[PDB]
Design a binder for this molecule. Structure first.
Ligand SMILES: CCCCCCCCCCCCC/C=C\[C@H](O)[C@H](N)CO
Ligand SMILES: CCCCCCCCCCCCC/C=C\[C@H](O)[C@H](N)CO
Ligand SMILES: *C(=O)CCCCCCCCCCCCC
Ligand SMILES: *C(=O)CCCCCCCCCCCCC
Ligand SMILES: *C(=O)CCCCCCCCCCCCC
Lengths: 268, 60, 5, 235, 283, 235, 60, 151, 32, 60, 60, 5, 5
C-alpha cells in the first residue's frame, strides 16, 4: 500500500499481548480454516462449556532453544507444550474435554551475512516413531509429552537395547520426519520456511483439527510442530555459529467441557 | 425409482445413458455413483492469509 | 418413477 | 419364475466391480460428518503442492538430509552443469519419491505441464544469475550452457524474491506418457547452470545451498490405476 | 459444480512479453506454491484440452477390493491335545500393506465398507478318502459379544451378531457395512493415549500404548467349517477383501517411505534407506 | 431367457438379510390382533424405566436381597464415600444387570444422558443432607467430598419428597461409547457423600437404607446389535 | 405396483431412494419395511392416575 | 516352485485375429476379454482335488510383477483382479480404449530411440518397429488354493 | 407420526436457577 | 432409461422391436449396438484431384 | 533502538499489573501485558500501559 | 404403477 | 423413460 502497508510487516494482538514483525513472509492459515468455537449443529457434550477467552487466548512464550551447525531439528505437541501456561493450562487440567485452535509464531533473526533455512511444519496427528526394535507403540506418556521443552530430531536411528528397563522414548529420524515418511514431502502439511536472507519468522494459524468435535486434551495431542534445518546455519567463516529460536504460541477459540477436580498427571 | 444418468462415451462404434435402481433400504448397500466433484487446491497450495496475485511480487 | 441426471 | 439366461462373467469376483450388496448392520445409527478442515476431493490436488527434490543422491548424501541440498559456490563462471535430471517424474530416482512422484506410481499414465521452483538459501549479501533449462527429448542431453540455452529456459536473477519457477510445458508426442522409464514416452532434460556467478562480499559464506521443488500445473492428469512398487510386504 | 470427469483448462495462446509482471519470481517461504501455467513463462498456442481427472478422484483412487487378511480353518476331528481349527481375526486394514499405504495418504476418512470373501480348500493328506461340500460360517463378533472358544459352542447360534453361511464353490460372499466409527471420522493416526497416567496411581495402572485408542476398535471375524469332520483332512483359507465405498478423506500426508513395522508409525533398523545412488549431474 | 450375470454375494445366507421368501401356508386365515395393554415399540422405552441398582456386591451380600440396600447411619460427619461406582452402564457389575445395562449388552455402542434416583427408606423422624456426584473422566476418582463437589452434583435434602435425582449429562469425547470397559470411552465417576449427617431423635432406628435407581433420559440411544454375554448354553 | 421410499443416507460420496416390489400374494412372504414408529414411554414410565408435572412436588 | 503364469498382453501370439486386424493400419476399440478355464489330473493317483479358485491379475506397466504364487503383489489393492471359480461360467471383463495415442498402431515404421553420434551404438539401439516395450502390461494367473497331495 | 429413525430431541441451552420449582426432588413410591 | 429399436426381420412366422438397458456407468461395458453407418468408397476408389465422370474419357 | 542498521533483534516489553511477584524472568513477564518488538526499519516500538487500577485515581 | 413414501 | 430408434 501507498500508505506503507507490507506483507513483511505485521502486528498480531490477542488478549493483553502483541507481536510485531518487520520481516515476515506473509502468514499461513492452515487448510484455509480460521479457528472457530464449536457450533450447535456439531456439538456433542451437553453441559455449558467454559470459554476462558482473553484469560487463555493470549501469546505464551516457550523456552528459547539454540540453532547451531549440528542441530538436527526440534518438535513440540499441542496442546502439550502449553499444559503449564497460565490459565490455559489450568482450564485444560480441570476439564475432561477441551478444544482449541492456535496462532503459532516462530522467531529467529540473524544478519544479512548469515544464511540458513528452517522448515516449520504444523502436522495434524503428528505420531512419532519409537526407539525399539523389539516392541512397537511403546513410547511412554512421559516421553511422548515433553511439555514446553519439546523434543528433538536425530540424523540416526539408534534402537534401545536395554530390555530390562527400556527407555520408552521416541527416536525421530529427521529425513524420515520422525514417522517413516520422507521429509521433502512435509510441505503438504501447512508450513512456512524461515530462510534468513528473506524472513525472520513463521506464523501459522491453526484450526482445531480432529475426528471429533472435542476430545481429551490430556490424553491426545491434535497438532505437532516440527522445525527442521532445510539448509544449515552458516555465518561468515565461523566454525561454530549460533542463533536462537523462540516459539510464542496463542490458543484461540478454546472451550472446555466436563468440569471436575484437577488432573494431576504423572509427567516424570 | 429408477435413476437415469449419462455415460461419458470414450470409443464410439446423442447421449448414451445407463440405469440404476437401489434394491436395499440402507445407503451403505448402494454401489458408488462415481458422480464426484472437484475442488480448487488452494487450501493446500495457497494457504496464505493475503491472496496471492501471481504477476505481483510474492513479497512486498 | 424416474430421475434423470 | 421369470425366464433368465446366465451370461459369461457370472459368479466371478472382479475387485474393480461396482455392485450393490446386502447390509450386515441394517438400521444402524450412523454418526454424522463434521466439517473437518483439509478435505481432499482429487489426488491431483496433492500433486499440485510443491514438495522438495532429493537432488543429490550420491552414496554418502542419499537417505540423509543432505540429499535435498544443492551446493553452490562463488567460484568463477563455468558453463558446466550445477545439476542434471531426467523428466521422468515417476521413475527418475530424484523425482519418484516426491509427493507428485509417489502419486504417479499408483497410475500407469501421466500428462500435462509441470513446474520446478528453486529457493536460494545463501546470505542476503550473496548475488547471482542462474539458468534453469528444459530440453525436450531427442537430442544430446545438455552438458554445457550452450546447449541448454537453446531449449526452454528461465534466467534467474537472485534477489529479494527468493525463489524462481521454471514451467516444463507439456511437450510430448503421445497423449499420455508412461510412469516408467520408456524411450518412446521420454520427457527430456532438466538442468541448471551458472549464468554469471555467485558473488559475495568479504565476511560472507562463499558456499550455499539452493533447494528445489516440483509440482503439477492445473492441466495435469493421470490414469490407469495400478499398484506401486514403493511399498512391499515380504512374508 | 465442477465434476471429476470435466475436462481440464484449455491452454490459451500467448505471445512475447517485456513488463514489470513477474510470474516466474516468487518466494516459497510464504508456504504457498506458485500457481503457474506454461503461458506464464513461454509462448503458447491455443489447445483445446480434453483430458480429465476422473480416475484420480478420491472414490476412483480407492474403488478396488484389497486383501486385508487370510484366515485358516480346518475340518478335523477334535482330539484331547488338539481341537478342530476355527479362525479368529481382529478386523483391521493394517495386517497387509497396500490398502494401508493408500489410506495413509490421508489423516482421517469416512466410508462404507464392502467386504468380499474368497474361499479355497484342499486336502492335506494322501488318502484317497473324500470330503463332501463344505459350508462356512463367518460370524462378526462386535466388541463385547462372546468370542467362540470351540468350533461348536453356543456363540455360533448368532441370534444378534451378523453371520454369513457361505457355500463352497459358489460365488464369493459379500456384505456391506455403513460408516460405523464412534468418532465423526475414522482416524488413520491418533497422536495420543487411551489413558492419562495419574501421579497418585502406579505407573502400571496409568499405562497404555502410544497411538492406540479403543483396544478392540472394530471387533472380530470368527470363521468355522460348519460340517462335521471327515475321515480325511481338509484345510481351507478365507481371503478377506476390503473396498472403501462412498469415501471422504481429510488432511493429506506424505506416503509411507520405509517398510511398515507394526500397527504404529514405527520403523526398523536396516530398513531406513529407500533412496538409491544417483549422481547430481547425471541424467 | 433375460440375460443375467450372477454377482458376488450370490447364494450366501446372511442372517441379517431382508428378503422375500415363499409362504409355506398360502391363504391361511390369520387371527386378528386385539388391543393388548403394554405394547412396546422401541427397546429404549424400557431403558427409560427406573430399575434398582445392586450397589453392594460384597462377598456376603451379592446374589441376595441385601445387594440392593445401601446402609446409612447417624454417625458424625465424614468426608468419606457412602458409595463409589464407575459410569460404565453395560460393564460395571453394579450397573450391567439393571434393565438399562441388560439392553445395552445387546448393543456395541451407547450414547446420551442418564439419571440416578435415590430413595431414602429411614423413618419419618430421620433427617439428613447428602451429596450425589458425577465426575467426568480424566482425573483422580473422587474419594473425598472435596473432590466430588467440584464436579456435577446435587445436594439432597431429606424430607417429604422421599427421593432425589441426579442427571449424569452426556459428557463424552466420542459420539458413542463402547458397551465394554474401555479407557478411551470411559464415562467417569458416580459417588455419594454425607453433606451434613443423618440425624435421628431418641426411640428411632439409627441405621437405615437408601435404594438407588438408574434410567436413561429421552436423548439416549444405542447401536450396532450384538449377542450378549449375560446368557449362555454350555452343551 | 412398485413402492419407492427414501434411504436415510449415512456416509456420502437430493434424496436417495430405493425400490421395492412384492412378488407374493401372502404378506407373510414380504421383507420387513423397517419403516417403524416410535411412541412415548409413559405407559411404563409415568403409569400414574394423576399427571405428573416434574417441577412440582410429586407428592402433594 | 508352484507354477503361476505370466503373459504379456498382445494379439500377436496367435494368428487369426492378428490377420483380421492387420487389414488396417490403425484402430480404436473397447476390449472384451473372456476367460475359459480347464483343469486335469496329471498323475495316476486316485487322490482327489477340491474345486479351484483362480486369480487373474492385470499388472499394468510399472506395477510389481509376482515372483512367487503367494507373494505380496497378489493383494491387488489397485490392480484389477478376477477371482474365477472353477466350473462356473467363463469369466468376462471389459476394457475401454486404453491407448496412449489417439489410435492403436497395428504398424509403427520407426524406433523408440534415436541413435546419437556422441553416444555408443549400444546405447542408441532399439528394435525396429517397436514403440513402448511393455505396450499394455501383463496378466498373471494363479491357483489360489493351497496344494493338494495330487497334482 | 414420530418414526424410529427420527433424531432425538435437541438439548436446549439453560442458565442458572433459584426457584420453588423442584425437578430434582421426587418420590419413586408413586411407581413413576 | 430403456432404449427401443427395431429388428430387421428376416424369416417371418408391423415392426418387431427389441429393448436394451445399460447396466453400467462405463460405455466400454456396453454391448455393441450394430447400428452402423456406411460410406462411399471414393477416398480409396476415386482419390483423384479432378472428379471423374465415367462416361467421359478418363484422360483428356 | 540506536545500534547500527546491520544489528537485528527481538525484545519483549512487559507490564505486569500489581499483586504478584515482580517479574524477574521472561517466563513471568510473558504472562502479563506485553509487546514483542522486532528490530528493523521502524526504529522504535511502543507498549501501552493500559489504565488497570482498583482505585479511580492513584496517589502521586 | 408407483407408490412414493 | 424410453428412447425409440
Ligand atoms: C458378517 C461380516 C460383518 C463384518 C462387519 C465389520 C464391521 C466393522 C467395520 C470396521 C471398520 C474398520 C475401519 C478401518 C480402520 C480404522 O479406520 C482406523 N484404524 C481408525 O479408526
Ligand atoms: C482383469 C483383466 C484386465 C485386463 C486388462 C487389459 C488392459 C490392456 C488392454 C490392451 C490393449 C491391447 C490392444 C492391442 C494391441 C495394439 O493394438 C497394437 N499392438 C499397437 O498399439
Ligand atoms: C422406480 O423404481 C419405479 C419403477 C420400477 C421399475 C422396475 C423395478 C425392477 C425390479 C426392482 C425390484 C425391487 C428390488 C428390491
Ligand atoms: C407395479 O408393480 C407396476 C410396475 C411393474 C414393474 C416391473 C415388475 C418387475 C417384475 C415383477 C414380476 C412379478 C413378480 C411376481
Ligand atoms: C429407464 O431405464 C427407466 C425404466 C427402468 C426400467 C426397469 C429397469 C430394469 C432393471 C435395471 C436395473 C439397473 C441395472 C444397473
Amino acid at each position: 500500500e501507498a500508505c506503507g502497508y507490507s506483507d513483511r510487516v505485521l502486528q498480531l494482538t490477542l488478549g493483553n499481548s502483541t507481536i510485531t514483525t518487520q520481516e515476515a513472509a506473509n502468514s499461513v492459515v492452515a487448510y484455509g480454516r480460521w479457528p472457530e468455537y464449536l457450533r450447535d449443529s456439531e456439538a456433542n457434550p451437553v453441559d455449558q462449556p467454559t470459554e476462558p477467552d482473553v484469560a487463555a487466548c493470549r501469546f505464551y512464550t516457550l523456552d528459547t532453544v539454540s540453532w547451531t551447525k549440528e542441530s538436527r531439528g526440534w518438535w513440540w505437541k499441542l496442546p502439550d507444550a502449553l499444559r503449564d501456561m497460565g490459565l490455559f493450562g489450568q482450564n485444560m487440567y480441570y476439564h475432561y474435554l477441551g478444544r482449541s485452535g492456535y496462532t503459532v509464531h516462530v522467531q529467529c533473526n540473524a544478519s544479512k551475512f548469515h544464511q540458513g533455512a528452517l522448515g516449520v511444519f504444523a502436522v495434524p496427528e503428528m505420531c512419532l516413531a519409537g526407539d525399539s526394535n523389539t516392541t512397537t507403540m511403546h513410547t511412554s506418556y512421559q516421553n511422548a509429552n515433553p511439555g514446553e521443552k519439546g523434543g528433538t530430531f536425530t540424523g540416526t536411528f539408534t534402537p534401545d537395547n536395554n530390555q530390562t528397563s527400556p527407555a520408552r522414548r521416541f527416536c525421530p529420524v529427521d529425513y524420515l520426519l520422525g514417522n517413516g515418511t520422507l521429509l521433502g514431502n512435509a510441505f503438504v502439511f501447512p508450513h512456512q520456511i524461515i530462510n534468513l536472507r528473506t524472513n525472520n519468522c513463521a506464523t501459522l494459524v491453526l484450526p482445531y483439527v480432529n475426528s471429533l468435535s472435542i476430545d481429551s486434551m490430556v490424553k491426545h495431542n491434535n497438532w505437532g510442530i516440527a522445525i527442521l534445518p532445510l539448509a544449515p546455519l552458516n555465518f561468515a567463516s565461523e566454525s561454530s555459529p549460533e542463533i536462537p529460536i523462540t516459539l510464542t504460541i496463542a490458543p484461540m477459540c478454546c472451550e472446555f467441557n466436563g468440569l471436575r477436580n484437577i488432573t494431576l498427571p504423572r509427567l516424570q | 425409482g429408477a435413476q437415469v444418468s449419462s455415460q461419458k462415451v470414450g470409443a464410439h462404434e446423442s447421449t448414451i445413458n445407463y440405469t440404476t435402481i437401489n434394491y436395499y433400504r440402507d445407503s451403505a448397500s448402494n454401489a458408488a455413483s462415481k458422480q464426484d466433484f472437484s475442488q480448487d487446491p488452494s487450501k493446500f497450495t495457497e494457504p496464505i492469509k493475503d491472496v496471492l496475485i501471481k504477476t505481483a511480487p510474492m513479497l512486498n | 418413477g424416474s430421475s434423470s441426471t | 419364475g421369470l425366464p433368465v439366461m446366465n451370461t459369461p462373467g457370472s459368479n466371478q469376483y472382479l475387485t474393480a466391480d461396482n455392485f450393490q450388496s446386502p447390509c450386515a448392520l441394517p438400521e444402524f445409527d450412523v454418526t454424522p460428518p463434521i466439517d473437518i478442515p483439509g478435505e481432499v476431493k482429487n489426488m491431483m490436488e496433492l500433486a499440485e503442492i510443491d514438495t522438495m527434490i532429493p537432488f543429490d543422491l550420491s552414496a554418502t548424501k542419499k537417505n540423509t538430509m543432505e540429499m535435498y541440498r544443492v551446493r553452490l559456490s562463488d567460484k568463477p563462471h563455468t558453463d558446466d552443469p550445477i545439476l542434471c535430471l531426467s523428466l521422468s517424474p515417476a521413475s527418475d530416482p530424484r523425482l519418484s519419491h516426491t509427493m507428485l512422484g509417489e502419486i504417479l506410481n499408483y497410475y500407469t499414465h501421466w500428462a500435462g505441464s509441470l513446474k520446478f521452483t528453486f529457493l536460494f538459501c545463501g546470505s542476503m549479501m550473496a548475488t547471482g544469475k542462474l539458468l534453469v533449462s528444459y530440453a525436450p527429448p531427442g537430442a544430446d542431453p545438455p552438458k554445457k550452457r550452450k546447449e541448454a540455452m537453446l531449449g526452454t529456459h528461465v534466467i534467474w536473477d537472485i534477489g529479494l524474491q527468493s525463489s524462481c519457477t521454471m514451467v516444463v510445458p507439456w511437450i510430448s508426442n503421445t497423449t499420455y506418457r508412461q510412469t516408467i522409464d520408456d524411450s518412446f514416452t521420454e520427457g527430456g532434460y532438466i538442468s541448471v547452470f551458472y549464468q554469471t556467478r555467485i558473488v559475495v562480499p568479504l565476511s560472507t559464506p562463499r558456499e550455499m545451498d539452493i533447494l528445489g521443488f516440483v509440482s503439477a500445473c492445473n492441466d495435469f492428469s493421470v490414469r490407469l490405476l495400478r499398484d506401486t512398487t514403493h511399498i512391499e510386504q515380504k512374508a | 459444480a465442477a465434476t471429476s470427469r470435466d475436462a481440464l483448462p484449455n491452454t490459451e495462446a500467448s505471445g512475447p512479453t517485456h513488463s514489470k509482471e513477474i510470474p516466474a519470481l516468487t518466494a516459497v517461504e510464504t508456504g504457498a506454491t506458485n500457481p503457474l501455467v506454461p503461458s506464464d513463462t513461454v509462448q503458447t498456442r491455443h489447445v483445446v484440452q480434453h483430458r480429465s481427472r476422473s480416475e484420480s478422484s478420491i472414490e476412483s483412487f480407492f474403488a478396488r477390493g484389497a486383501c486385508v487378511t487370510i484366515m485358516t480353518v480346518d475340518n478335523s476331528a477334535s482330539t484331547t491335545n488338539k481341537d478342530k481349527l476355527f479362525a479368529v481375526w481382529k478386523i483391521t486394514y493394517k495386517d497387509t500393506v497396500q490398502l494401508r499405504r493408500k489410506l495413509e495418504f490421508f489423516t482421517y476418512s469416512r466410508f462404507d465398507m464392502e467386504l468380499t470373501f474368497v474361499v479355497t480348500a484342499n486336502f492335506t493328506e494322501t488318502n484317497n478318502g473324500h470330503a463332501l461340500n463344505q459350508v462356512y460360517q463367518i460370524m462378526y463378533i462386535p466388541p463385547g459379544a462372546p468370542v467362540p472358544e470351540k468350533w461348536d459352542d453356543y456363540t455360533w447360534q448368532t441370534s444378534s451378531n451378523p453371520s454369513i453361511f457361505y457355500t463352497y464353490g459358489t460365488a464369493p460372499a459379500r456384505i456391506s457395512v455403513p460408516y460405523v466409527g464412534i468418532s465423526n471420522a475414522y482416524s488413520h493416526f491418533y497422536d495420543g493415549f487411551s489413558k492419562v497416567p495419574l501421579k497418585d496411581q502406579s505407573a502400571a495402572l496409568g499405562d497404555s500404548l502410544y497411538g492406540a485408542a479403543s483396544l478392540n476398535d472394530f471387533g472380530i471375524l470368527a470363521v468355522r467349517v460348519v460340517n462335521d469332520h471327515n475321515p480325511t483332512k481338509v484345510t481351507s483359507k478365507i481371503r478377506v477383501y476390503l473396498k472403501p465405498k462412498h469415501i471422504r478423506v481429510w488432511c493429506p500426508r506424505p506416503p509411507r517411505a520405509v517398510a511398515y513395522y507394526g500397527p504404529g508409525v514405527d520403523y526398523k533398523d536396516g530398513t531406513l534407506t529407500p533412496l538409491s545412488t544417483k549422481d547430481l549431474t547425471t541424467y
